[PDB]
Amino acid sequence: GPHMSYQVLARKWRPQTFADVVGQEHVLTALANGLSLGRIHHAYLFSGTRGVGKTSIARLLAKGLNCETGITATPCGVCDNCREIEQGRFVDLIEIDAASRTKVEDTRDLLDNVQYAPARGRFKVYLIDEVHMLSRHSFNALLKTLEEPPEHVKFLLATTDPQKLPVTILSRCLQFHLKALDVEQIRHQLEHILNEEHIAHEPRALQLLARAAEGSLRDALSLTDQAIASGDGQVSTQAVSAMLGTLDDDQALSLVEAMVEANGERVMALINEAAARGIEWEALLVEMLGLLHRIAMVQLSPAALGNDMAAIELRMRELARTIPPTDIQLYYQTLLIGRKELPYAPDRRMGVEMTLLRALAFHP
Amino acid sequence: MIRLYPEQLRAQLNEGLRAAYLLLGNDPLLLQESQDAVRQVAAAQGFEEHHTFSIDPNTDWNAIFSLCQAMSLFASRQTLLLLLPENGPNAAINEQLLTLTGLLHDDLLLIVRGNKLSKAQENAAWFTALANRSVQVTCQTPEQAQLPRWVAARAKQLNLELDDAANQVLCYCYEGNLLALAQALERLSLLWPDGKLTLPRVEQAVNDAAHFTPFHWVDALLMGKSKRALHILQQLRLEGSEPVILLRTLQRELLLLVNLKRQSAHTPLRALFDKHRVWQNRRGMMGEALNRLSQTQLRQAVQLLTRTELTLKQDYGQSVWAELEGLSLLLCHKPLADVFIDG
Amino acid sequence: GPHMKFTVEREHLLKPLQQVSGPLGGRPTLPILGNLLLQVADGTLSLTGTDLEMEMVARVALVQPHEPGATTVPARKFFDICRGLPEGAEIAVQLEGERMLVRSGRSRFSLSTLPAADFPNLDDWQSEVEFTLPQATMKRLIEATQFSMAHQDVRYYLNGMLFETEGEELRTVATDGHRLAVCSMPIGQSLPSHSVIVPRKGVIELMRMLDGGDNPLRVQIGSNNIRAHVGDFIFTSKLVDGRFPDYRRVLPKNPDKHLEAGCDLLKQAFARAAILSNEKFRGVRLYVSENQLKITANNPEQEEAEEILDVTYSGAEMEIGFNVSYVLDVLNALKCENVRMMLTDSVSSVQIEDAASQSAAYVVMPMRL
Amino acid sequence: NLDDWQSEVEFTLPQATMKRLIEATQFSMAHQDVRYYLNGMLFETEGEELRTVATDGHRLAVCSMPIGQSLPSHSVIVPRKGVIELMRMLDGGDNPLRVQIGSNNIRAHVGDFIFTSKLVDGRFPDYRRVLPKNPDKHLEAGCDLLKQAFARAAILSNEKFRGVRLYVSENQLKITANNPEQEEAEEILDVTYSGAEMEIGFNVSYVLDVLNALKCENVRMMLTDSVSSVQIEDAASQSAAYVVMPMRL
DNA sequence: TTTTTTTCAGACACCACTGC
RNA sequence: AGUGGUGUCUG
């Protein structure tokens, strides 16, 4: 793609217009309507998940704010000021890594920069990434500035855990929540990126990568660059699947699936995988116990599946609907007994293997 | 003083402005909107200069006294604001609040913002001296049985058309989260200038933010609503609530339930309720719960609760939230297995 | 070539670097704003220090062979090297690759530098007021109002100082919401009327650049920036937005009563009253009668001071409540022996000024009595 | 209060003498070291001489001054806090200083007031073995001349471990410093010397403190090889010696 | 009406006020 | 830089 392929797909591929953003349609539509209608809030807090675009959206909104063509939902192409945000630096757009500059003094300097006029753009736009890491006093200063901000100053805050922001900051910020990307959106964007990179790709590898991304597009892009690494400039399904298996840590769920199914060779293969990964064995037993307990609770009531396990919903459903509660009870008891007797074993590996052997031998 | 809901505040402000305004309650949104309305009305009657202070043990009271007594070169008609701390008017703060109550004047307007005041604990002195010529504004979060009509009123006053389905979806995702609920209505107005909100429109542009307290979880358990209780439990897990607080909050009502079910063989539940000093709204749901699969879940659930308590209080890895799911499912007419109960 | 051939003595370089260092040394917003910008041009060295709001430039004459290069080098390391090397040591700095070599008699240093293309420079702007002024006049203009400036007030326009060019005079105005300080002096030249708000840092550096000699301080002001030339030191500072409160309105419109006294006696009386003034609710009360001024304050100790016979007065008996800090700062900035105050009303503000020198006028808003 | 009726050693010492004696050794103590016997200063009495020894296992400092009064050989370790606060209270050199050292506590009568402290139980190491026993290379320089060159070299020094390489050639000394940024400082100084080319890398702060302790005009350094220690003292006396053990980097 | 939490040990992170 | 406090998160 680029002048020698060192340039990372994650950073080279970053939206430059609102249309290049993958379907975070909620915030994009609301912000476009606000910009076009003139309804502007003092602060625009952005949040959501890692690698779903909150910093990209904030940068594009700053470009739209400070573009010389006017407050537009569509920043233009050349517009030298509107270009300075991407290539080079823009004077009036202040990008702060609030994680690097959490101190009230570092933010004090910029909040004293607030009252000075913008050089070129209309608005002294502030992009404060990882806003949740500012100290209590930095938050106090930011709030004090947010009470009465001048008409030439707007704040753009991005974070992953808004719960650490004070309610006083949240009341003055119109938070825009970004939802984790779907597998279809991630797969389609990866397909487009690889097609425009002239990279040979197999359709199934993209779905595997998207499923492995866990909803974050940047995870998909990093896994994609790594998959190109594992190979010679081609994203082959076999190479991608082998890489994913190497990176795989979902051993306990597969172990429960294979043990309930009574698949001894698959169980032993999964135990070999968990051994080669240097995975703790007591942790493996605890994960299997938790999975079985959750399966039982789902069998009692479908609402037992929270949003903490959205990656493994379907499998859980499949295991809860098809396995009677008696077998789950027996397996939970067997694994509890095995974990109780794990310390007194030839080694943890043999203890876990024997506990799973007992669970298989039950065949209930 | 004049005790007032946010509904009539405007009217009262049109009637006149008192010496001090006390904005109290647990709802950030209601307090914020009340403060904005008070400041706008004050500015209409010449109160131009504003100030802010956080009532803290480290605050500089001398600045407050100096600005309240002295006047400025411009905008003599001045207003002052104070954020009360989380606990409230601490015993080291009541005396200085009394001094402010002496250091006031008709030129200044005082705004008092903070959580609800335990009037049973704190009364008179500061309270009555303001009550002389002041306004109290109660801004508390509407509960679940009251939220739908509040959201309907807000939609009507913002010129939106909410049906019952969108109203209940909004009341589902945002509880104790009136600030984000109002922001959601504003975002939905931004998304569609039509102003007509249907089920899919709100359903797409909504997040399950919510905010619950362990009392909500215990009430959901007493009503025996599985999905409601599990949603509350997930919400307190994501919010980062300490599970031991949940344990104690459930334990109090669970031991009360055990006592009531044991004593109900000799005494009707009414006299038991009177004996234990339990309130009427609590009385209804506890009477509903007492005759809902009792005498088996009340010892099995105590067994599981003791298991969770000991597991939580010996190690440091916690992992008790699934056990709390077990409790949430046992007390909601969904019998569990002895395997997970005993352990 | 790459070597910005540079050779100067220490005696002509220590003071320029000390001036250019300015705000550098601490953690900068951008990593380059901790490096001095060194430029060689037309037999002159330009030292530049930038804070993204302030721009200090020093010019040093080159009387030795040189090459036109430029680069940015860490300020503290370069300054420590420069003063570390012995007296009269002819510094010779050149460059190669991304490292510049400092050299003195029997000593060598190597420093890592950054390109000059990346260092910020404040954009050129058109100037409306080209103003030249002696040093002591600016010194007094700043010193007579710097006390009345705001202290990190939420109102930006309160922070800083107002510069007004009106006809043949220049005026400095300062306000903190309760005090007003105005100092207007003729300059001998005609300028268009203009109003500018200068931040606190710009005022502090303007006070800093003042020299004890006779050099015309040259002020060049645009719509958004101010520049000061003092010998070979050039200062650029951006301005504070907003509207400054119109000092003419707060000036007591129609005074009718006035007290006349001396600076030292009033200073001593107010200092004595300060001790009997509580830090909580700090202020003073002035009982004013015919040729009588009694200064007390509010305090549980309930003390009193009386120096009524040391003042001349011709109005009615009435009381006005000042504050310790306001009156003390105003009298300290009014070094003249004679002093007078215009009592208009208890509600209205009070003007403090010299008996016949009305250039430095202060306006204090009293308390509510 | 005073139950230490018997004292091991007694001094009637001028204030300036002990001021120099501590000031020439204080910087080499160990602060909160695991070797509890090194978290202090060793006062050693032999003949008419009192010596202060301080080391942290990376630098040794010994300073000896005559008293005139014959005293039995004795050793004592005064902790960091006690010696630092004794130094702080040691002002007004007009009044003499009385010192009373027992087997468990130390007392210092300064002016009119009395100071009391406890001892460190451990036994201080022998510093004679730390001192190089065969110094074959001896070089001389000016104290201020050498010190300013070290300071200029230390300007561009590794901020974590301030270390310089010192090279010695015929009537020439070399000090080279570098930091993780490859910023190189090189200072060459004219000395009087006779020996062989040798490089040795040692800390800068320790050498600078040694030079600051020797408020003299001529300095003699004694070196054996690239791996052993360096003994620095003044050329006008032999009452104060310092041992800098180099780095192996 | 209010009603809400164990613990011993350790690791950071920020912010006075001091002290040069 | 030394000292003391707040507070949050890890077993």
Ligand SMILES: Nc1ncnc2c1ncn2[C@@H]1O[C@H](COP(=O)(O)OP(=O)(O)O)[C@@H](O)[C@H]1O
């Ligand atoms: N909506 C999106 N559209 C396109 N790329 C995205 C999107 N969200 C994330 N990315 C990819 O992830 C990379 C980092 O995105 P970023 O917006 O910084 O995430 P964050 O929300 O965690 O700050 C981007 O360079 C881009 O490649």
Ligand code: BEF
């Ligand atoms: F940059 Be994101 F919040 F991971």
Ligand SMILES: [Mg+2]
């Ligand atoms: Mg980010």
Ligand SMILES: [Zn+2]
């Ligand atoms: Zn553009």
